[PDB]
Amino acid sequence: FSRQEFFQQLLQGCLLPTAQQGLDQIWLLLAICLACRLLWRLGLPSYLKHASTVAGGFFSLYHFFQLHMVWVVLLSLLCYLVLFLCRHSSHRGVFLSVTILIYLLMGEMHMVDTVTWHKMRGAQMIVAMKAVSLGFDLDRGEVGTVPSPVEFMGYLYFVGTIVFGPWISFHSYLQAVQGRPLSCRWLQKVARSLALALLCLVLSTCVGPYLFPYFIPLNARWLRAYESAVSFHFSNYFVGFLSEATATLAGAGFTEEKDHLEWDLTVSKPLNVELPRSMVEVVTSWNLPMSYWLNNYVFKNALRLGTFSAVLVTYAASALLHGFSFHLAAVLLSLAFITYVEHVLRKRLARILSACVLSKRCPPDCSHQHRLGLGVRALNLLFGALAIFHLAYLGSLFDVYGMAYTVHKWSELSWASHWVTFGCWIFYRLIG
């Protein structure tokens, strides 16, 4: 309707209810995180700290997931079983990952209660990532000892990263257990991340799907595609900032080097996906802990199959972790092909033009003759516009289902991004 009517309704109709909903759904989790933070600072024995965070994680899983949380509980116990029967092998990663894969597949069979499994898939993904990462860290020799039962459980049920929180390596959780002083930088990080979480939530809900009609005089197929993409991106950024605010409030999420404690846990970078340089930087800046996990474990293990095969295996692992579904396997396959073609085409262009057009910011150690000016700037802006166009075309599916909905939404856009990537690959092959 009218723009003046919409901006009259804006403040009290959407911005206050959305912020109230967010605060109401995160207040108890934040209270429990602060409770464990204050408890772990008193100086209890380590096993009491691990037991306390097991209890806190049980209560958080109950509060969010009423009684179906038992599924997640199984995923923990099973994992420890698989980490106790092969504690002496160099296959800990292989066995834990195969167990996780079998579990998630037998969950995808929809014989279990389907309505709530799709709700718990987030916490289950976090727990599975944690177990696989601990297995592979013990394999490679980065964790010295196989953890005791209570240490492993307090790691999986860490109340800061149980529901939303990102994956943190076993040693990050151990140092979180050790505790740090409550300096003002910690409170600054927690408050900044909470404020940005609420801002991203209200932007996704009450500023994103009403952008081009009201917030811009522009208003269509591509406009609604861009609006859906922006709304989904900012919902994900809400979840990311909330995850880092709840993992920094609990104690974890810090990096120290030579007596310099700096709380710098970052889960997502909105300024690298909303003003992108390339699709590689988009898939890397979308979720930094999950990108690190995928890259390190899956990619560095499957790097024998070849570069492209390893990239496809990484995107298949991502599709499995996030739950197999058409409009997600299709998006992830399109991302695989888009990032591959763009990366390799930009690499050949940077080798031929001897300029800095690499899919990422190259440093001052370049072999590149053209570093600044206008041609480099113009080409990088062209590729950034291409990345925004790809993001719109891909996120158009998550408006505001099955094969029919995906084909419909991608035919309404005349299959633009796929033809663009195909032409880019042809141009790559012609010049090299």
Add this chain to the structure above:
Amino acid sequence: DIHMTQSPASLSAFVGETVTITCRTSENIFSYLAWYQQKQGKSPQLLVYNAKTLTSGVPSRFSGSGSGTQFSLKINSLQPEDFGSYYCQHHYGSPYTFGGGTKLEIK
């Protein structure tokens, strides 16, 4: 990485006496420490792990203790086969560092 300060550098006693070696850790390692014994000319042998657990074969007179950033190995009733170098090595996580050593001799 983690720096391991082992003390004393040298230590001498009689056959049957009791000695104690200290290992201070630059960081907190959650009682993840091993004690190795290397005699003159041979390779080291793992005596203690997890800062408290004796291995299969080592006599019961070796006693490990400590936690956090302070650990100790106590040897009661020194026998002639117990005079060598002793190294404390953390197994918290890579890179695994050792201590300076403690050359136990007879005087």
Add this chain to the structure above:
Amino acid sequence: EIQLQQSGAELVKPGASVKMSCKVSGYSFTGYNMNWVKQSHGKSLEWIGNINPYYVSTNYNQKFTGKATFTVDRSSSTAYMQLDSLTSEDSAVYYCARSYGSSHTFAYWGQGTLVTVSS
């Protein structure tokens, strides 16, 4: 009975490269990480790195990266470490030590290979 038979001593010219060897016999070669450790003459021990024989991924000490490279041979169950550009300070004794399964404490050690760099 586990036994890590480690190759003989080498006398290398400065700037050249050396390649130790550690033949494992007594257990499944691809079931435990193989650690490589360096000890100066009468000084403390130094953990060079390790190699996982199942998947050949290695894990180096940053002080020794680019200096030592680990390889394996499952057909002969033998682990090799190659040192590159040996300075006069690389004359030491190098041990191969198997991890104690669960822990990464070095349970079974070799006998040591003496690398001496001179002219």
